A = this chain, B = another copy of it.
Amino acid sequence: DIYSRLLKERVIFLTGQVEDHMANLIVAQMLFLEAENPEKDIYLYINSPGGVITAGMSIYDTMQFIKPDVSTICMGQAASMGAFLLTAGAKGKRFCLPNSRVMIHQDIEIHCREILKVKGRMNELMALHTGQSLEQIERDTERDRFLSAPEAVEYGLVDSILTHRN
């Protein structure tokens, strides 16, 4: 199994729709690697169109909680909940491969109330990670747009562009 062998090189993959089980499988992997060695870096390859907020947040909170710095490489695309986790990687360790696309955007009374709290919480965290203002993120997260690798770096969404192994 390749995925197991690449785990020995502390590399984890995030592929496809984010839902409970693949998230739990990522959280499992992160906690495992930390256990093996809490000092070295985890490498998370993100290629996801997005998915369930509740699922993706478990992955986020694991990245922050564990002592290892998690490094997020975006290959292919990082849209919405994907983008969110890509930008949530250890500071100075977030990358795009050159041709990858990042994108942002995602009874009655009691539930509308809750999505609005959640939405505000996302924006607050995402501004904090990209270095943008809370206000700027609000405008841009409504804008159903795609950033290129360079633009994601200009936007503070990732740090630099992976281009060639040195």
Residues of A within 8 A of B (CB): 1-7, 9, 11, 13, 15-16, 20-21, 23-25, 27-29, 31-32, 34-35, 38, 45, 47, 49, 53-58, 60-62, 64-67, 75-77, 97-101, 106-119, 121, 125, 142-146, 148, 162-166
Contacts and interface: CB of A to CB of B under 8 A. Distances in A.
B110 A112 contact: no
Given A61-B75, A107-B144, 15 more contacts: A2-B28, A2-B29, A13-B24, A15-B21, A20-B76, A23-B76, A54-B100, A54-B101, A61-B98, A67-B166, A101-B114, A101-B118, A107-B143, A109-B119, A112-B112
A116 B165 CA distance: 30
Given A24-B15, A61-B100, A116-B113, A2 B107 contact: no
Given A15-B21, A67-B164, A32 B6 contact: yes
B32 A2 contact: yes
B31 A6 contact: yes
Contacts of A118: 101, 146
Copies held by the complex: 12
